[PDB]
Amino acid sequence: KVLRDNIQGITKPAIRRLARRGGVKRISGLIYEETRGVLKVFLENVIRDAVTYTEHAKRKTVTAMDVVYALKRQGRTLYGFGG
Amino acid sequence: RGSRRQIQRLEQLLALYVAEIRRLQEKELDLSELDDPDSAYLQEARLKRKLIRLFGRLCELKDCSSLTGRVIEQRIPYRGTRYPEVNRRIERLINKPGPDTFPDYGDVLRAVEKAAARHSLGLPRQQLQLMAQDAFRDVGIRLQERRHLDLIYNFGCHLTDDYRPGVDPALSDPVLARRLRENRSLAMSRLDEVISKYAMLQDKS
Amino acid sequence: PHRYRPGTVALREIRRYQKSTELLIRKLPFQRLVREIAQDFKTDLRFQSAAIMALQEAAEAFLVALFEDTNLCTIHAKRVTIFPKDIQLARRIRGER
């Protein structure tokens, strides 16, 4: 009845360490898939904004500056950066 | 006091590593490169590790500590209870060095209990619990703040060092601003959606 | 105490390099995740390496803060295991938007 999911990519112990870095010592089975999912969604959000800036500048390369402008629009994570 | 010549040699090497790190930071990676174990991103990471090792060796040679002025090196005081021993144990708990220092309620409560039993303060269980809860709340605020500042004070590289929010292209192009506003509505929904999706899967199990 | 200040490199640079060594997600899977996402947008997108770094530093901070919030809302004499509903609830209590 219990099953082990496959993945390519982000390993269980990295996720355990991220949780631990937040003070969380014990996480359930769904927390792994959730953490990968949340990570992917956050990255999609940032990259969607970043590429909007890139296309506005008429470039094909997403620059670190594009990513900064995007990140500032994602709420508290980078709040206050640069001033 | 270390050898002046060797210090100068190692500092030259350090500057070389920095120049190469900057070069790699500016490389533009296509999709196949992002799939490559030897991409500029990975080379850069290896080189940073090499550089930090060399920096540590230079600290050794100059008889210095390994500190770099990180915000997380700043001590967070706690004097929130009426028992200086409890305050001591909590303050020690939250100032353990490194990037992983963040206790849970259990850690704080354990610190309060241990300080109480060690110094025979004779505090009853519910007083200890309330003390731990108030302490946990206070230190949680301070830890999150210290991490936030460490992040924003140490973010990016030379390519983002001239960033300032008043230069945001969106401020002078309403078409761009409109698109970003649309993006933001979508982003918030997507995040809610994933959080809620796994909550729902949990409530199906 | 005693602090080393290199003559050839500013400490702020050193600090950022050190921080980069502190990341927890292996960089190869990270860059591959960015690739997986980018593939959906445009086949011809390139990324500055420094942009990938900014993404990773920010993303790890974002995940960790989700866990910090959950932690701070979790008050029990006996340690429990964190489930999705705990993340969700904490996010509603002290999290974003």
Side-chain angles (χ1 to χ4, degrees), chain B residues 11 29 39 41 104 147 203, chain C residues 4 31 47 56 79 85:
Chain B
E11 283 190 346
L29 293 67
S39 78
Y41 189 55
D104 62 12
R147 289 189 165 169
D203 277 333
Chain C
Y4 171 51
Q31 75 167 18
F47 284 85
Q56 188 167 354
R79 282 202 176 80
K85 292 187 76 162

Side-chain angles (χ1 to χ4, degrees), chain C residues 22-56 58-77 79-80:
Chain C
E22 292 169 6
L23 294 165
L24 297 165
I25 302 177
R26 299 187 97 99
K27 297 187 169 64
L28 175 58
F30 188 82
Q31 75 167 18
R32 280 178 175 159
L33 178 54
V34 172
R35 173 189 176 275
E36 177 181 315
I37 286 166
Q39 275 184 333
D40 295 332
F41 284 88
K42 274 211 275 197
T43 184
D44 68 340
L45 275 177
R46 291 181 307 258
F47 284 85
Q48 252 181 359
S49 189
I52 307 298
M53 177 54 61
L55 286 171
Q56 188 167 354
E60 295 205 15
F62 177 83
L63 296 177
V64 169
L66 289 183
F67 289 109
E68 290 168 354
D69 282 345
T70 304
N71 174 24
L72 293 168
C73 297
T74 300
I75 309 297
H76 297 291
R79 282 202 176 80
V80 293

Side-chain angles (χ1 to χ4, degrees), chain A residues 21 25 44 53 56 61, chain B residues 28 107 147 168 173 190:
Chain A
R21 183 159 288 179
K25 292 175 160 76
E44 284 171 352
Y53 278 100
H56 180 267
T61 298
Chain B
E28 312 186 358
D107 294 326
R147 289 189 165 169
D168 187 347
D173 191 326
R190 293 274 296 151

Side-chain angles (χ1 to χ4, degrees), chain B residues 161-198:
Chain B
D161 279 337
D162 299 320
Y163 162 78
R164 62 179 191 271
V167 192
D168 187 347
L171 298 173
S172 58
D173 191 326
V175 169
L176 171 59
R178 194 181 325 114
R179 184 54 68 84
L180 295 168
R181 212 154 49 235
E182 196 185 77
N183 287 359
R184 174 86 273 233
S185 171
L186 175 60
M188 288 170 157
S189 286
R190 293 274 296 151
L191 275 172
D192 286 349
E193 182 209 302
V194 62
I195 297 293
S196 142
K197 189 243 277 223
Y198 286 87

Side-chain angles (χ1 to χ4, degrees), chain B residues 70-78 80-88 90-134:
Chain B
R70 298 274 300 280
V71 181
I72 49 163
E73 297 164 10
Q74 297 177 15
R75 174 165 271 261
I76 299 173
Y78 182 78
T81 82
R82 302 171 211 278
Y83 308 91
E85 307 90 5
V86 174
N87 293 338
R88 264 180 231 121
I90 288 161
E91 192 176 308
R92 288 191 267 114
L93 182 66
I94 68 188
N95 286 302
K96 295 191 254 200
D100 297 278
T101 305
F102 207 111
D104 62 12
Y105 171 70
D107 294 326
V108 175
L109 172 63
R110 187 185 119 95
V112 177
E113 287 171 350
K114 256 91 233 95
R118 150 74 176 96
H119 284 273
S120 291
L121 305 169
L123 305 189
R125 156 239 256 190
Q126 297 182 91
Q127 185 181 5
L128 291 180
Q129 288 171 356
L130 186 52
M131 195 163 316
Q133 274 158 62
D134 295 337

